Design a protein around this ligand. Sequence first.
Ligand SMILES: CCCCCCCCCCCCO[C@@H]1O[C@H](CO)[C@@H](O[C@H]2O[C@H](CO)[C@@H](O)[C@H](O)[C@H]2O)[C@H](O)[C@H]1O
Lengths: 1043, 50, 50
Amino acid sequence: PNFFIDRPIFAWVIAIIIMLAGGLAILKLPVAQYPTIAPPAVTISASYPGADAKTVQDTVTQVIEQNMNGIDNLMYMSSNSDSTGTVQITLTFESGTDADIAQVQVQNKLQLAMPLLPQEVQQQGVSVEKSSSSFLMVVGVINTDGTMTQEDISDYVAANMKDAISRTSGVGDVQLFGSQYAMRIWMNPNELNKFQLTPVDVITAIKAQNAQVAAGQLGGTPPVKGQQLNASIIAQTRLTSTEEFGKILLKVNQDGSRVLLRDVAKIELGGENYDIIAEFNGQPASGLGIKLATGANALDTAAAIRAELAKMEPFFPSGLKIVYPYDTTPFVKISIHEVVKTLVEAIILVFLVMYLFLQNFRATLIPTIAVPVVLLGTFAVLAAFGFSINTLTMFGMVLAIGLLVDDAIVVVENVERVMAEEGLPPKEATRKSMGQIQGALVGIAMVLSAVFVPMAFFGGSTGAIYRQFSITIVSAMALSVLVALILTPALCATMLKPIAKGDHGEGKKGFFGWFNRMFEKSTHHYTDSVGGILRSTGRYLVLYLIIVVGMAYLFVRLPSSFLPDEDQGVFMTMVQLPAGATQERTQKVLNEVTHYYLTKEKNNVESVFAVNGFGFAGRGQNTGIAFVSLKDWADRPGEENKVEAITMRATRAFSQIKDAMVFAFNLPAIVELGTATGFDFELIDQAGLGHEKLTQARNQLLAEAAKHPDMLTSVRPNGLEDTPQFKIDIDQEKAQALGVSINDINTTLGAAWGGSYVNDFIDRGRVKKVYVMSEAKYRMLPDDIGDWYVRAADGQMVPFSAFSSSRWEYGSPRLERYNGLPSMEILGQAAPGKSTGEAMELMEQLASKLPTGVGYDWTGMSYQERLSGNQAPSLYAISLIVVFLCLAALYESWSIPFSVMLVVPLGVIGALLAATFRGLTNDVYFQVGLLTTIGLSAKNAILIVEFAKDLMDKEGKGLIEATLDAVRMRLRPILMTSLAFILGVMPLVISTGAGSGAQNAVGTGVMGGMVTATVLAIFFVPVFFVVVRRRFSRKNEDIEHSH
Amino acid sequence: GADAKTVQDTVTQVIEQNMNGIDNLMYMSSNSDSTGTVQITLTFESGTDA
Amino acid sequence: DTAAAIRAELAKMEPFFPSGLKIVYPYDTTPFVKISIHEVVKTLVEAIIL
Ligand SMILES: CCCCCCCCCCCCO[C@@H]1O[C@H](CO)[C@@H](O[C@H]2O[C@H](CO)[C@@H](O)[C@H](O)[C@H]2O)[C@H](O)[C@H]1O
């Protein structure tokens, strides 16, 4: 400590070592927008083509929900049974669980269910995956010549690019947007009734002529003695061409003129599914969602991927151009550009404050070398714990710049003051001052981690977000107190200039600040004054109670955010038609929307990625979505050229002037967020009930919560209501008669109207599928039911209308389950004034008004809130108590910690103030901000109380005279820090452009906080000290001691 | 019964498509035999957890 | 804790049970571990007092 004063070089060496480890950690440290924050979820998905909601709910879904037992750390299970036959089961696991293990255990219990599945599902594929939605990037592929359709493009994407980019370093999951080429066989109902054939015969035909065969080998083992030739027998090779599919023989006519498949059906190379259609600025497109690899660098994955795409540019088909619809990367680089700008700026301001105050270049260089070192190291302690350069951790740095800077300033100052006062040569001056602040700095260390550490231990997703701040800040802190104890005292002692005793440089100079006098008189003004506010403390205690209560009111009338919504260079607009609607109507809406953007937002939009068949509303022709891109930030200057007003005006258009609801909006920060003032409800059927009864229970709870607009707002179901569905009743009897097989009936009806995945071929060197399905025009209207004939065993065709009734009814197209049982999901948020939890309780008191077999439960956001929200008081109680014990340690008091713990309010009231006036909100950044503020409040109060005591004890000064001296000698440094801080933070607060919402959240509270903090503390701390001190023993006294 | 080429473009190349974003992979090498055997080796950065 | 968790799921199922269906408790290694280790605590505190 003292030690390194006589070893500047041992210190330089430690400094150097920390700088080198930091910079090493700086070159090879990952960069991403946010760290892993959401609990781990694994998804099982299967597609049962042709099935309806109930078919998949009961054939695949429930069989899997039954075989999901004994998997470690299950939080909950949710599943969709979509009317496109796709079922999606999400198991969301307890926070921080091994993703890898959870997925493997899930997949190996699913694999125990696999035989219990239907063979279309078994062969279509059940898939188990990690449930991130956070795509690093969505890359679009097009063709300018317009030559190729989506299916063309998609196939190409799959066959040239998808793999070499997925070999690009930093790329984890690669996922394709669209369907690959399969052999599409479009049957004809006439040309089928003509040669008296059914789908079944087409099927078996295709299974027959199109396969590989278990052949054998010439000269094989075991051979015959003397054998001499050994070679592999080739047999039936699968068909490569459309051509050979035209040539497949369906039947022989009696006169022998034959029937090839070519005749009865249209045969083409066509997409594996035609549900979802993508337009890129109206131009045909397919896409690739690339995910950042696990632990990888986002920005270099981005540069490598773009370079690997461009390397392919000499091999691209004509006019086929790559495009970039969604890119996390540019926003991230620019976020980082601004954080770096900040750190170096806040630094630069500290140099200015320190010069235009200590007016000595070499004093000015010491913190100039101190914090660079504190930085580098913090990067290393973070590198060591496996953290990354993302939003939360860097704004953790920003948030910490104040304690780091302060720690340097306190020291350099105290030394210079020792010289200014006492006239010691520099080295002896530094031992004198270090000798004065050392123990306090250990104390400050202890009270600071005492507030910053409990916030590491929060639970859930919130707990994650906090742990980033907690750790970043405690490491910056710990390293800043070491740099304060090893390097700076050594830098102070070695490169600091001696001051002639009582110099103060008053007058002395002209061009560069008569200021000193101007500063000088003033500090006396200050002390003359302060003893007076100690002359009659009463008033000031009143005022204090006032400040506190105000702090509380200001605090309660504060809104509770989670994170700021940010213009991310991209947003999206989602489209919903009425139920039952067609691909064509929906597509109409998307086209309209796209043109609105490309027209009336000609200055803003760059590109519109319209996607039909896909909503986040659900799956269906009915739903559509348009992924919207904006021009880079330097070209969108204004206030209504930014996302707020863009989405505002777009939704403005599409609200009134439509037959369908189309809302356009900006995405949450953490792309899987909680809705702060809300909930995600699950109403559940527990006793064996039918969909009709639970739905009625949902309607009932819906109407009951609509009846409380004083507590709840927009409580809605998160599915699709029942639609009309069209039932075919096969009178088993009537067709039993007609000499038909029901297998043939069902499966011909099937392969006609849904289609059938039959067999596989080999296209251009790539195994791809073969589907057989009706052509378009024979399967649209219920009348087309007639065009289909089933051949009897005796030899005659039969119409469908000979053995079937047909009708309309309702049914549900989307069948939800919660933890194995049938459920209906209600999203919703709390009335503007009240808290989410209260609305949650009102919801429980409401859904308790539901029938037997109607139970409820909470999920996702409301799960994470109901388990981990009663924590906030326990942890800050540990903070209050731990901080109190640390200070009690530092001094020697059960009371003196009270003069310094009482300082906390003085800081908050400016922060609540600032939040309130800038109309911001009590969010994460505000809270870490709060702590930071309280943090310096305490640092300062601790140094002033320390000094007062030191004078009382180690000099026999009185109470008031010592508090006066103390406050005096610490006036200059309080001000030095606070000037720099306030000036370093200042830019954060005044910023518009990429992410400046954070910068705002961080800046505001801090600035106001610092203001009310210093400019209160320099008046209340003596009062805090003096009053508390007058509730201790006897004599001494008012004090003129000895020794 | 299948041939070398059959398994290289039917089974091998479909499996090597999915071996990306596997953590601490040094290189990948694969065999495609006419006895139908397909054989893929993923070789990892030293000290990776097996 | 697996026991507390099981008691929790059971407590979730109790309100939708048919008429008169009651859970009963024939066998549990659990209450013994709790009350046995608790006796070791009463001992500790008593020993303090002695
Ligand atoms: C960090 C940025 C700095 C900006 C802050 C600038 C200072 C703003 C607040 C100064 C407060 C001092 O207010 C001070 O009150 C005390 C007592 O209450 C007064 O003192 C006088 O008034 C009272 C009667 O009212 C007497 O009991 C007292 O003994 C007498 O000396 C001082 O005349 C006044 O200076």
